[PDB]
C-alpha cells in the first residue's frame, strides 16, 4: 500500500525506515525472482510429456552451478550486512537527534489499558493524547505500570517496548503538522483494543503553548501518588483527559514502585 502508514510516513525516522525497507526488498528480488521464474520455466520445459527436451538422467554435479549458486547469495548478504550494521547504529531508539532545538521531554506510562503522558517541564499530564510542535525532536521516556506493552506511533517512526520497573528511551520527529494514531503493539490483557491514543503535531509553537494553556485549566490534578493509583485502576476505552498539577518527579516514583536503581 503506497498510502500506507509505513510507505508514506511523515517523520524522518520512518522516512529512512522506508528507504531501508525498499533497498532491502530490491536487493532480495535479484535472487528470488529468478528462483520462481526458473521454477515454472523448468516445470514446463521438462514436463515428462515433452519430447524435444534433453533428458539427462545422471547429471548430478556441475562445479559451475555450485559456484554460481554459492557466489550470488554470499554477495547480496555481504551488502545487506553492511547496510544493517550502519543503519542499526544510525537508528537506535536511544540516541539523540541532531537538530538545533531543545527536545521536548514526554514521559509515557502504560496503565492497565490506557496511555499516561507527563510533561514535566510543563507540569501537566494527559490521558490518551499528546502534542508537540512539528520539526522539533521529541524525547520519550517510557515505563509500564502494569504488564508488557509497546509504545508505537506508526507513521512517525519506531516502536519500543515498555516494562514495569524499567525506563526506555525513544526519539522521534514529525516533518508535517497533523494528527497521528498511536497504539500499543504488545498484547496486555482484556482491553488491549482500546489502547489507542492520538498524537498531534501542531504547526507552530504558538498552538503548542495554547494546548499547554488548555491543559493548565483542568479541574483535576495528579499530585499525590493516591491520584495515580486512583487513575491506574483497571478501565477501558478511556476518554481523553487533562490534568492541571503534577507531582514533580512522579515518573521516577512510579518506576520506584518496583525498585530499580544504578
Amino acid at each position: 500500500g503506497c498510502n500506507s502508514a509505513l510507505l508514506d510516513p511523515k517523520g524522518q525516522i520512518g522516512l529512512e525506515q522506508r528507504s531501508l525497507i525498499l533497498t532491502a526488498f530490491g536487493l532480495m528480488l535479484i535472487v528470488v525472482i529468478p528462483a520462481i521464474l526458473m521454477a515454472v520455466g523448468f516445470a514446463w520445459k521438462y514436463r515428462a510429456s515433452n519430447k524435444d527436451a534433453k533428458y539427462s538422467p545422471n547429471w548430478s554435479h556441475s562445479n559451475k552451478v555450485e559456484a554460481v549458486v554459492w557466489t550470488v547469495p554470499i554477495l547480496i548478504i555481504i551488502f545487506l550486512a553492511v547496510l544493517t550494521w550502519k543503519t542499526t547504529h544510525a537508528l537506535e531508539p536511544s540516541k539523540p537527534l541532531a537538530h538545533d532545538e531543545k527536545p521536548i521531554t514526554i514521559e509515557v506510562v502504560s496503565m492497565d489499558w490506557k496511555w499516561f503522558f507527563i510533561y514535566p517541564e510543563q507540569g501537566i499530564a494527559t490521558v490518551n493524547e499528546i502534542a508537540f510542535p512539528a520539526n522539533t525532536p521529541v524525547y520519550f521516556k517510557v515505563t509500564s505500570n502494569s504488564v508488557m506493552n509497546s509504545f508505537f506511533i506508526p507513521r512517525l517512526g519506531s516502536q519500543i517496548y515498555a516494562m514495569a520497573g524499567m525506563q526506555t528511551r525513544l526519539h522521534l520527529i514529525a516533518n508535517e503538522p497533523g494528527t497521528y494514531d498511536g497504539i500499543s503493539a504488545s498484547y496486555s490483557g482484556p482491553g488491549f483494543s482500546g489502547m489507542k491514543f492520538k498524537a498531534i503535531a501542531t504547526p507552530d509553537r504558538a498552538a503548542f503553548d495554547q494546548w499547554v494553556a488548555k491543559a493548565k485549566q483542568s479541574p483535576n490534578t495528579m499530585s499525590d501518588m493516591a491520584a495515580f493509583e486512583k487513575l491506574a485502576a483497571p478501565s477501558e476505552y478511556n476518554q481523553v483527559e487533562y490534568f492541571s498539577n503534577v507531582k514533580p518527579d512522579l515518573f521516577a516514583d512510579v518506576i520506584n514502585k518496583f525498585m530499580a536503581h544504578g
Partner: protein, 99 residues
C-alpha cells in the same frame, strides 16, 4: 566405570588437592580477587577434566568416536547460551536504567 584401582586412587588424590586448595584460598584470603578467581576457575576446569578422564573413562575411540564429538558439541552449545545470555541480559540492563 572400570579401570585399574590405582588409577582411581590417583584421581581421588588429585581431586582432593584440587578441592582443598580453592577453599583455603578463598576463606583465609591469601591473594587478590583476580588471582583468586583465576585459580578457582582454572582448578575447577582441571578437576572436571580429571573426572571425565579417570572417573568417566572418556576416550576418542569408543562409540566410533561419537562419544567425544557429542560431548564437545554440548560444550559449544553451552558456551553459546550461557555466555550469549549473560551478554544480552547484561546489555539489556544498562539500557533500562534511569540515565
Amino acid at each position: 566405570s572400570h579401570g585399574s584401582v590405582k588409577t582411581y586412587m590417583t584421581g581421588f588424590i588429585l581431586s582432593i588437592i584440587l578441592t582443598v586448595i580453592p577453599f583455603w584460598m578463598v576463606m583465609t584470603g591469601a591473594a587478590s580477587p583476580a588471582v583468586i578467581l583465576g585459580t578457582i576457575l582454572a582448578m575447577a576446569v582441571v578437576q572436571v577434566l580429571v573426572h571425565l578422564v579417570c572417573f568417566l573413562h572418556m576416550n576418542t575411540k569408543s562409540d566410533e568416536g561419537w562419544n567425544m564429538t557429542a560431548f564437545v558439541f554440548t560444550v559449544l552449545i553451552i558456551a553459546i547460551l550461557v555466555v550469549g545470555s549473560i551478554w544480552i541480559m547484561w546489555n539489556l540492563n544498562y539500557n533500562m536504567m534511569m540515565h
